[PDB]
Each structure stands twice: as C-alpha cells, then as structure tokens.
RNA sequence: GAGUUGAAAAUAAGCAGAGAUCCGGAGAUUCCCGAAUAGGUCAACCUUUCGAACUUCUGCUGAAUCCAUGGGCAGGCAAGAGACAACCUGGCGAACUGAAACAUCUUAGUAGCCAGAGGAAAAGAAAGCAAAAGCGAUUCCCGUAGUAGCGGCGAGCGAAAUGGGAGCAGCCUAAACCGUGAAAACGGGGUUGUGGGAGAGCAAUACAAGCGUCGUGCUGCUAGGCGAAUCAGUGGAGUGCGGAACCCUAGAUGGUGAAAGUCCAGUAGCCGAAAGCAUCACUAGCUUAUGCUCUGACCCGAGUAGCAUGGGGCACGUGGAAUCCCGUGUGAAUCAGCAAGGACCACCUUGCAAGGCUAAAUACUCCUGGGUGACCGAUAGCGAAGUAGUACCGUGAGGGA
RNA sequence: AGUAACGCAAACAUUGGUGAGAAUCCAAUGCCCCGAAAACCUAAGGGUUCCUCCGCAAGGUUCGUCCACGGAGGGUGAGUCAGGGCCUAAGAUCAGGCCGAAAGGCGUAGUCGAUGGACAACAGGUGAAUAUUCCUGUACUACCCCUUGUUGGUCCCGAGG
RNA sequence: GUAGAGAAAAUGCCUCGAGCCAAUGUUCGAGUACCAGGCGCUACGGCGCUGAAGUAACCGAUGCCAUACUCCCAGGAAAAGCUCGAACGACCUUCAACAAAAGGGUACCUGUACCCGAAACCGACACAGGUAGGUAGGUAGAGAAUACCUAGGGGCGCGA
C-alpha cells in the first residue's frame, strides 16, 4: 500500500490565494503564484492538488511557515503554462 | 457597558417573552408620550423594548460623509419599553390587554380582553 | 516485598522499649527465607521465598492445598 | 426546504455528491478571494449540506451494525485514496 | 408560534406560517495533545510497515522439559489504566507545643505523603454484654459523665454497663454422608446454640414469603400552555400623592423613565410527554421447603487457639493486666468439649473463634435544583463584579495584584 | 525642590529641505572616533523588534516632524545549508529478572539522546523586507524507466574499516 | 596463490610489482559576465547604451598537504554508513532479482526576517558589565600589543 505521511482532507488542503502586489510580481516575473495552505500539508499533497484541480504541470513547490500560524506556498508552474493566463481565469 | 450586556446561558442570549408583534397598533400607556396610537417598526426582544412610528423623537447629529460635507441632522426614534404599550382595534378605540383564544382549528390567536375581535393577522 | 505468598505474613510495626521507656520504631519482619522445595505433582524442585510457618504448612499439609489456598503455583 | 432526495440516493452518488460539493466549496473560496460577486449563503449551505450528506451516510453506517472505531478505520481507509477532480460546472 | 444567523452594533447574502431562530429527549461528528495507547517525543510534533501499545480473557501452534511454563501468531465494542473538592478505608507517620525545663506522656495516630473506592465508606448478625435479674447484629444522637479509672497518680487522658430515640434484615459457604473421577474438584445434604447436623426408621402435603432482561401501570423530572382585575390631574418621567372603580383559588418575585394586586414577564389554580430516567405496584419464571423417635462413637473452619518471649492497641503509660491483633519459636480439644465473664483455680451463666456478603440511620461539598438571610456592597464579599489565578515576579516548586 | 542628576571627557559645525513648531529628523560638505572593532556573518536566547504608510495620548532621563513606541498591511521560498526521516558517547528510560510499606530502587536486551561519526551547490543577477532557498549558467547526490549478462537476491550473521 | 576445522579475515609460507601520496597546477566551466571611464534624462533617489588591460615577480599565512614525519608518557571514544564473505535461519521468484554503461524523469518535514563584542540576549533600565565560534587589510613594529588609517560603521539621546 502507498500511504501518505498523513491523511489530511485533500479538498481543503488549499485555502486562499494571496493578492498582494508582490504576488503579481511573482506571476509576471517567475511564472509562479501564491497560495495560503494549512500547516498540515506537503510538497507531495499540494503538488498533486494542482495538477488535478487546475490541469497544469507544476514545476516546484516552495513552502514556508508564517508566524501567525498559517502556511504560505509559492507554487511555480511549468514553462509551458503562463501563470497570468491561468490567474486571470481565477480572478487575480 | 459590561453591566448592561446580554446575559448568555450556553452562549445564546436570553430572549424575553412579550406581547407585541410587528404590524400591531400600540398605545403608549404612561411614560412621556402618553396617549397616542402607532404602528411598530423594529423589535428588540432582549431589552423588551419596541420602537414605534412617528412619536418618539430623538434628534441626533451624524457626521455624514468622510469629506466633511453636509453633516446631516437626522430625527430618529428610540426604544420605549414593551410594558408601556397596549393594543388597539380601530373599531373600538380603547387600549386593551391581551388574551390567547384557542379557536376551532389548532391555531391560538391573540384577543383584546374587553372587546371581541382578534389582533392576529393572516399570511398577508 | 517481605511477604510470604502462601500465608499472608507481613512485617510487624512494633516499637522497642529501653529501660528508661524510650521508644523507637523497629519495623519487625518475618524470616521468609529462600528455599527450593520438592514438588510432587511435577516431581521437581521449585524455587520459593517461604516463611517458616508456611514451611510447616507445606510439610504438614502438603504443597498442593497450600499453593491452591494461595492460588499460585507457577 | 426539505432535503427528501438524500435518503433516496444510493451510497455511490451520495459520496460523489459529497466530493462535488466540497470542490464547489473550494471554488467558492477562490471566488471569495477573487472579490467577484458571490453568495455567502451558498458558502453556508454548501458545507451545511455536506453535514446532511454525512449524517445520512453515517446513519447508513449505523443500521448495518459496526463499531465507531470500525467507522474510523473505514472512513480513514477511504480518505487516503481521493484523487482530486474539478466539478462538472465548467 | 414570529422573526432569526452568540456577546455585538454595521455590511453582504440568506433562512422562515407545507412552522425558521429557540427549548427538551435520544443520536452523529469530535483534528492534535493529554491514561494517550503503532514507535519515538523536547505535550499540542516527527516517523510510519495506519497499528486499542501493555496487562487480563478466549483460540491455535506449542522451547530447555514428557506433561508444563515461557514465547509467537490470531480474535475481541475490549475487562483494567486516567481524572475526582470534601467525607471514608489501609499503610508510613512527625515536630513546634503543653508539662511553665525535659526524656515517660501530650500535641497525635492529628497534619502531611502514597494507594484504593462509593455516594456514601468502614463495621456488622454474637466463641457478645450482663449478673443470678435479664437483653438480643452493626452504625449514629442525648445521657450516665467529666463518673469508674489511667497517669514523672504530673501535664493531662477518659470509657463502659443500665436507660431514652433514628433505623431495622438477615443470609450464603466448609466438614461429617451418597455418586463420578488417580488426586484437585464437582452435583445432592447441612449450616445451628438453656446445642445442632450426619446415620437408621416413621409421616406428610400445601398456607405464606423472597428474587427477577421483558412489557403493559402509576406518579415525579427533563420543553412548555391557559391564566382575574382601572382611568385621569401633578413641576422630564408616576408605580408616589389627591379623586373615582375592580380582582383575589392570584398582595411571592423581577422589571418598566419613579416606589405596582389591577403595565409586562409571571404567580395561585387547572392542564400537558413522542423519548429517556426514577418511584413503588403486575408478569412467563426461578425458589425458600415440613414434624417425631433412637443414636454420647461420625462432624461442627489447625500450624489455628494457647504457652515462653518482643510488642501494639483497647480511656487502662507493664501494672494484679484480663479481652483484641501481630514478629520468632513451640504447639491442642470437638459438644462427656472449647472460649469469655479484668491474673488464676473450682462451680454456674453466656456464646460457638480460627469462612465470606449485606440496605437504613451516618459525615462532607468541586457541585445541581428550589427557599431563605438582624450576611457583604467595590480596602467588603470568593484571590477574582472587565484579560482573574489574569498582567507581573521566579529556572522551577510557587507567590500574586 | 524646581535641588541632585540627565548614564564616560569619540566632537561636532554650517548650509539647505520637511513642518504649525527643528541643536536633535533628512540631504550635502568638511571635522572627529573604532578599525583583532564601536566592522560583517552565524550558535544560543528573544519573538515580529524586520519593511512601507500613518500618528505623536504614554515611553525615549531634553526636544522631536524621528523611533526597537501606537495603528493598518506585508515579509522568513532549500534534494545540496543546519537538525529529523541514519548512527551512537556521557546520560536517561528500562520488556522480562532481582529487591522493596506504598511511591519506587538496582539492572540486561531494546529505544531515545549531539557537543561527535555518515551524507549532495557553487558563481553572477534580482530585490521596500528573502537568498548556497527565487532567475540564469554550469554541477553533484538518491531511486525509476530505457539497453548486456546472471539465476538467485534481501536481512540476520563472520571480518576489514 | 596456498596450509591448518579455514568463505572473507587473521596467522604461517611462496611469488609478481620501483614506484607511491597529496595540496598545488594546465584546460573546460569562463564571457555576446564583472569592471575604470564616457555617452542621455533627472521625482536629481538612479536607470539607459558602449566598453580598454585583466599579466609577472618578491614576501607570505595562525589555511591546505597533514591523523606527513620526529619525540614523549600522562598511552589517547562508540556505533551506523562503506567494503568483503561460506554454512546455518526468515521471505519472493521469472521478464522477478542483481551489477553497470550512456540518456531522460522525479526531489521528504522543520529552521530561514531581524538583534546576535547587543538599545532587541542576560544584568528590573535604550544599564560605563557579561556572552561560544568564523573572516584577520596598510604603514612602523617580533607580534592578534601599540600609534594612525582603507573597507565598513559611528559621533556615544540634554544643551548653551
């Protein structure tokens, strides 16, 4: 059997995007975009929940904790997909 | 103002049982604005107070805008207590108490205890 | 513990008295000594920690009824 | 507004509808973050309806007759394999 | 039965006279830590073969060792762990103090510490008190009584019996004997005291009472419902005052601009439960079971009682020191007996230890639901009427507004 | 009592700017100080003090337009760096085992336990707050797939290191 | 290579190998980078285009070789990773397992700000005190003392 490290309610593993101006800097400059996830999350569970719900090959998943408690995730997509054409569809 | 906040048994506020519904014609019994009829507008169950139309006059001053313009003076009603009002039928002009008649169907309706008509309004 | 499993003999809280009636505590306890007694239902020695009164039972009454009186044999 | 249809639907379409309403709830989180015009009441009855769905599913766990910890092992034995899928509203 | 999405306003959208919000009964979820329990852990995390780990129970396989034991594997809604203010029981157990010092003694078997357990616990059904008269398990209260005593006869400690009340309830088991098995057990019998039981024989049948998933019964509780009777004048406001009326099976209370029988919520009274719990009363049913005569043989709880010692505790400090329980060592008798009646002996009286279980009266408050208060009113009353065991201090125990 | 003091005797001065208000905030020019630091980075600790804007009620031993202060928002990106997914020392906990009024004491296997042993990334740029972490270049680890052979392989055990 | 119960190892015997070891070094990485300068506007805070030489020698490290040698007694951790290997023991077996050769794919949690010879840590203070470790420029000097300075950072939060 292929167990994950922790079973963590995968339709709630992502919470909200970040709409700061530096996030748009990461879109136009990095082909990346910014999500807010819960602390109980992975570079294997978030990375699977982007290539399925969105339909995009994700390059890397750079995560960090934020001292108010919640977790911040810079997800960088592949070169084949612009983050600007996939972020205006959501509302960025 | 902690001396006047709502009491909360099991996180929900204790709501009072009263005798005035919306759309009723109340009379002010004693306090202040004595002896004038009126509809009620908005209801406040925790204070047991009721705001009624076009009688209680509280001329309040409001800073209107954020640009500092026109600063309007708005004349707004306040809360008179629910024990200071009675109900009124427009056929017999007399302020009367309440009563709960159980009619032929299952429903139980209000009743002016001195006259013979029903306070209770249908679905419209 | 300083108890015998067969007969429930424990220590005795019993003061000692000098000539001028001074009393210390002197916890007084039984001679429950190490032995290794033969067992007829297995024809073999068991290693036990027996008080001497319990020794007089297992030689007088036999080890079977004493060990079933305590409840334990293995 | 009575939800009479939930005790009519079988367990597979029940569970698939749970996953669809959770996905629509995540779309309501994206539309709430996007500041597009949204209904917060739908954000209420979405999760509030998934509560109804899991009460009916858990009653169906009850009338077979199994333990609470067997429902823990069965439920967590199911939650480990949920491939994410977007809702059919496109 | 009419508005709601807590405090807590505002804003955006809802939910609702095919009955929302809310209340009550029974259920569901309950991330992570914490008995914490898959393993580790620096609690609320990490690693995961996603696991009730360990002990106990059941089942299989069954080491040194033949039977065993240990181990391993498995099952299991799976019994225990952990928490609990005070009371209760069991064990360790002081010292300051009092004696005008202090060691015997007291404080004190109190505090404290550990363990356990219930709404009560312990004890409890006479090997008992008593005195020639009598009582009939245990517990608690008043009393005897500050008496008899005990005590460097100092300081102090201090019963018990007779009497009066609360509450009452008594039952299972071993042995002698029959039957099955190598014992060990099992099934019948018997469990009592101015003695029974076993063995042998004769009679004789049903009155009364005890226990109880199960469901109809009753009241009570956890939501509630109806519920009597007035206006007007007065300096902000009237419930107060003055004038006119009424209710009362309701004049308890709280509020309402201001103090209320007639304004509201209510109250007196009458009602009301789908669901759960509790109270006693039914029920298929299990049970208790009887009387006489002969028979001193057989039995009536053994390393036990007693004794020599070392003690402890009974108010009794080793004293004439009995009763009760233990440490070492010795070590009985079965009813024609044994133990107690304050060393001990003789007679009489009383009871039958060395096997267990029991409700009530009883002690207390972390509390809960009612009713009160010659109790407080922000230096008071709980430490705490707001963030209260909070800010703050300490490494921590802890202190603390 | 409006008294001592205002926390080294490195030392500031002027011109402009901002404002209602400037010895103190900013900018420039000189002057002066540390320079095995009074420089830069990381271990510990602290916990948001870091950055933009706003404010000057309290704090700053003066003032203040400034602030490690108050309010709102943001910021900490790792296969390679440091720990864990590896290992053990001191030490701790110790299954069974011995002991002990209780609690627990001793002690073996085992398991934790870095201050050590093992293991793979450097240079330039970006940037109000991040850089061996983000971008670009060249690399290196640990597994899978793609081609040749092998029927045995993994772990425990024996040894070198 | 053998020999003994002897797979590896260890010990004993025999044989082949004159070289070996490691900092440093040349090239690629690596220049259509960086860089002095000039060229055009200032929100005058900087951006924009172009770009020369980029070598040699003397000193010389407390850094490497280097757990390299010499000397001494006071005699200098453990286990895993790694490498080699028979029997015994548990499991899986053929397109399964093992060992490589190029080429692609994949990349586990926590810490990452800021102060850290301190105004933010510890001394109740924005306290003349304390705090492990790393980098060690020039001149005069034996020197990490000292005196003055580059980089970088300040003028010590009352003044007259």
UniProtKB/Swiss-Prot annotation, chain A:
**Segments forming a coiled coil:** none
Q: Which domain of life, per UniProt?
A: Eukaryota
Q: Where in the cell is it found?
A: Plastid, Chloroplast
What family does this belong to?
Answer: Belongs to the universal ribosomal protein uL23 family.
State its role. Answer: Component of the chloroplast ribosome (chloro-ribosome), a dedicated translation machinery responsible for the synthesis of chloroplast genome-encoded proteins, including proteins of the transcription and translation machinery and components of the photosynthetic apparatus.
Quaternary structure note: Component of the chloroplast large ribosomal subunit (LSU). Mature 70S chloroplast ribosomes of higher plants consist of a small (30S) and a large (50S) subunit. The 30S small subunit contains 1 molecule of ribosomal RNA (16S rRNA) and 24 different proteins. The 50S large subunit contains 3 rRNA molecules (23S, 5S and 4.5S rRNA) and 33 different proteins.
As a miscellaneous remark, the entry gives: Two forms of the protein exist; they have the same N-terminal sequence and approximately the same molecular weight.
**Protein name in the entry:** Large ribosomal subunit protein uL23c
Source organism of the structure: Spinacia oleracea (Spinach)
Swiss-Prot record, chain B:
Please tell me where this protein is predominantly located: plastid
Q: Look up keyword Isomerase and say if it applies.
A: no
Any GO MF annotation of the entry: structural constituent of ribosome
Q: List the disulfide bonds.
A: none
User: Which GO CC terms are listed, alphabetically?
Assistant: chloroplast; mitochondrion; ribonucleoprotein complex; ribosome
Q: Where in the cell is it found?
A: Plastid, Chloroplast
Q: Which UniProt keywords apply?
A: Chloroplast, Plastid, Ribonucleoprotein, Ribosomal protein, RNA-binding, rRNA-binding, Transit peptide
Q: Which family does the UniProt entry place this protein in?
A: Belongs to the universal ribosomal protein uL24 family.
> In UniProt terms, what function does this protein have?
Component of the chloroplast ribosome (chloro-ribosome), a dedicated translation machinery responsible for the synthesis of chloroplast genome-encoded proteins, including proteins of the transcription and translation machinery and components of the photosynthetic apparatus.
Q: How does it assemble?
A: Component of the chloroplast large ribosomal subunit (LSU). Mature 70S chloroplast ribosomes of higher plants consist of a small (30S) and a large (50S) subunit. The 30S small subunit contains 1 molecule of ribosomal RNA (16S rRNA) and 24 different proteins. The 50S large subunit contains 3 rRNA molecules (23S, 5S and 4.5S rRNA) and 33 different proteins.
| Protein name per its UniProtKB record | Large ribosomal subunit protein uL24c
Recorded source organism is Spinacia oleracea (Spinach)
Q: Where in the full protein does the shown chain start and end, and how long is the full protein? A: 51 to 174 of 192
From Swiss-Prot, chain C:
Q: Where in the cell is it found?
A: Plastid, Chloroplast
Q: Which terms under GO biological process does the entry name?
A: translation
Q: Does the keyword Hydrolase apply?
A: no
UniProt keywords, alphabetically: Chloroplast, Plastid, Ribonucleoprotein, Ribosomal protein, Transit peptide
Gene Ontology CC terms: chloroplast; ribonucleoprotein complex; ribosome
UniProt entry tagged with the keyword Plastid: yes
Q: A Gene Ontology molecular-function term?
A: structural constituent of ribosome
Q: Name the principal localization, coarsely classed.
A: plastid
Biological role stated in the UniProt entry: Component of the chloroplast ribosome (chloro-ribosome), a dedicated translation machinery responsible for the synthesis of chloroplast genome-encoded proteins, including proteins of the transcription and translation machinery and components of the photosynthetic apparatus.
Its assembly, as annotated, is: Component of the chloroplast large ribosomal subunit (LSU). Mature 70S chloroplast ribosomes of higher plants consist of a small (30S) and a large (50S) subunit. The 30S small subunit contains 1 molecule of ribosomal RNA (16S rRNA) and 24 different proteins. The 50S large subunit contains 3 rRNA molecules (23S, 5S and 4.5S rRNA) and 33 different proteins.
The family line of this record is: Belongs to the bacterial ribosomal protein bL28 family.
Protein name listed in UniProt: Large ribosomal subunit protein bL28c
Organism expressing this protein natively:
Spinacia oleracea (Spinach)
Q: Name the encoding gene, please.
A: RPL28
Swiss-Prot record, chain D:
- Per the record, the coiled-coil ranges are none
State the compartments where it is located.
Answer: Plastid, Chloroplast
Superkingdom field: Eukaryota
Phosphoprotein: present as a keyword of the record? no
Q: Does the keyword Ribosomal protein apply?
A: yes
Q: What does this protein do?
A: Component of the chloroplast ribosome (chloro-ribosome), a dedicated translation machinery responsible for the synthesis of chloroplast genome-encoded proteins, including proteins of the transcription and translation machinery and components of the photosynthetic apparatus.
The identity of this protein, by name, is Large ribosomal subunit protein uL29c
User: Intact protein stretch covered?
Assistant: 63 to 152 of 168
